[PDB]
Amino acid sequence: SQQTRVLQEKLRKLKEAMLCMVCCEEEINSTFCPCGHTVCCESCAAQLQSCPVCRSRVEHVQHVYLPTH
Amino acid sequence: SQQTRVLQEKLRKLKEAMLCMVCCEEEINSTFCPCGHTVCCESCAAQLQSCPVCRSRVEHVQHVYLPTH
Ligand SMILES: NC(=O)[C@]1(c2ccc(F)cc2)CCCNC1
Ligand SMILES: [Zn+2]
Ligand SMILES: [Zn+2]
Ligand SMILES: [Zn+2]
Ligand SMILES: [Zn+2]
């Protein structure tokens, strides 16, 4: 039905929100500290000296184990 | 259709996986450091001395800003 299409779009958007904002390919699993923005995979987070959301300096990267993983 | 019901179930399960494992009411937004388990809301994470998943000592809690928030 049309509701099947609506639900498919909601699921796609929720799944896309869990993917890295830089490479768009791998799941988010890393936090920039101390700002707390958790928007990258471990490979993109390792290559950024500044947070891509707020531009704060990245002091270090914390790996996150999320139940959605 | 039956496909609409299957998609509704997938959406519901993904949304439930984003909720605090202790209170089941608030969104997960806190990480236990250094282990990295990100399973609680700020209130529930505040008084735990050890991780409820792996038993590692919690040295501090890092707030996380997730795109799914
Ligand atoms: N000890 C902690 O877990 C907090 C904290 C963490 C790191 C830090 F540099 C200062 C304070 C304190 C307040 C609430 N939870 C966060
Ligand atoms: Zn990436
Ligand atoms: Zn940031
Ligand atoms: Zn809670
Ligand atoms: Zn843990």
UniProtKB/Swiss-Prot annotation, chains A, B:
Localization: Cytoplasm; Cell membrane
Subunit composition and interactions: Homodimer. Interacts with the E2 ubiquitin-conjugating enzyme, UBE2D1 (via RING-type zinc finger). Interacts with myosin regulatory light chain (MRLC) and TMEM4.
Tissue expression remark: Ubiquitously expressed.
Name under which the protein is recorded: E3 ubiquitin-protein ligase MYLIP
Gene: MYLIP
Annotated function: E3 ubiquitin-protein ligase that mediates ubiquitination and subsequent proteasomal degradation of myosin regulatory light chain (MRLC), LDLR, VLDLR and LRP8. Activity depends on E2 enzymes of the UBE2D family. Proteasomal degradation of MRLC leads to inhibit neurite outgrowth in presence of NGF by counteracting the stabilization of MRLC by saposin-like protein (CNPY2/MSAP) and reducing CNPY2-stimulated neurite outgrowth. Acts as a sterol-dependent inhibitor of cellular cholesterol uptake by mediating ubiquitination and subsequent degradation of LDLR.
Coiled-coil residue windows: none
Residues represented out of the complete protein: 369 to 436 of 445
Induction of its expression: Expression is directly activated by NR1H2 and NR1H3. Expression is not dependent of the sterol-response element-binding proteins (SREBPs). Expression is indirectly induced by LDL.
Superkingdom of origin: Eukaryota
